[PDB]
Amino acid sequence: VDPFYYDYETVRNGGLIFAALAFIVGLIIILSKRLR
């Protein structure tokens, strides 16, 4: 009922999930034992 309200929590958690995924994948690549 609040048109002047954007669900900032949804985008925030979406971006944080992405940040965690990218961080984990980066660690997997740099610490990879079989990616070379």
């Binding site: 048109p3 002047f4 309200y5 954007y6």
Partner: protein, 291 residues
């Protein structure tokens, strides 16, 4: 001196004439195409927003309580005896109120006569060109009690009784909602018109509240607030000469030669506050009549 100019191959600052011409032409065509791509992307973005409706507004919600005269550091200090120490506030008040002059609201194709008492939201329709330009609810300058620039041009500063006209931040498609009297147990005693957004000024500490004096609220119908019959706002494209509701507060009987900080607050469901934004729904003005 060799780097500055060598004439053998006609090199100036490092390269020959043909070199300068070639790099200048490359940079001209490159920067031209770059600025063209920038402008093109800007136009493609412009084709997404509309002329009378912004794609995002949660950054202006809730609106802010603004005060006239606007003051640097929000301090209204002057010497009532000296007519010069308060000329700045008078100039600002006159410049803002001139848009509300009795002569400014002449034509009826723009200005429409709205009720002398606060009424319900006068919904003009939708935000398109189908209904063309829109009507403007007139606001009589006389609705301000003793500060109208009609009988006393000074507005009170001449005899140590200033006036700070309060105003609400214009927000497109905003419908103020006064608090229901059922919930009325927190805010102080005020007149209750279900079509009036209330505003109440007080001190801030146990010292300013005492040294303040006697508040005098002036507004449409004698209600300390804004009448709901002036909202919603339809933007600057549909209502070019829209006049927003005003309200005045006169601080009669203020402690001379003493600075007192007062906070005015607009209550309502749609009106929030913030500890970081000292103007979101409320505001602060410290006044000192040092005569």
């Amino acid at each position: 001196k060799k780097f500055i100019w060598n004439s053998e191959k006609k090199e100036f600052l490092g390269r020959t004439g043909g070199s300068w011409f070639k790099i200048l032409l490359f940079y001209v065509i490159f920067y031209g195409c770059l600025a063209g791509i920038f402008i093109g992307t800007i136009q493609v973005m412009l084709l997404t927003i509309s002329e009378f409706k912004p794609t995002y507004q949660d950054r202006v919600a809730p609106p802010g309580l603004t005060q006239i005269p606007q003051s640097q550091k929000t301090e209204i200090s002057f010497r009532p005896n000296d007519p010069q120490s308060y000329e700045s506030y008078v100039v600002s008040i006159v410049r803002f109120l001139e848009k509300y002059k009795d002569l400014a609201q002449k034509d009826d194709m723009i200005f429409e006569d709205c009720g002398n008492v606060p009424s319900e939201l006068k919904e003009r329709g939708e935000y398109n060109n189908e209904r063309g330009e829109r009507k403007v609810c007139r606001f009589r300058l006389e609705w301000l009690g003793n500060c109208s620039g009609l009988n006393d041009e000074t507005y009170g500063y001449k005899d140590g009784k200033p006036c700070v006209i309060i105003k609400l931040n214009r927000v497109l498609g905003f419908k103020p909602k006064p608090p229901k009297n059922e919930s009325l147990e927190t805010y102080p005693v005020m007149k209750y018109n279900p079509y009036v957004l209330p505003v109440h000024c007080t001190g801030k500490r146990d010292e300013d509240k005492e040294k303040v004096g006697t508040m005098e609220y002036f507004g449409l119908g004698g209600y300390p607030g804004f009448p709901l019959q002036y909202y919603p706002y339809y933007g600057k494209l549909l209502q070019p000469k829209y006049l927003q509701p005003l309200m005045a507060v006169q601080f009669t009987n203020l402690t001379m030669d003493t600075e007192i900080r007062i906070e005015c607050k607009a209550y309502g469901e749609n009106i929030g506050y913030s500890e970081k934004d000292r103007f979101q729904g409320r505001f602060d003005v410290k006044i000192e009549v040092k005569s």
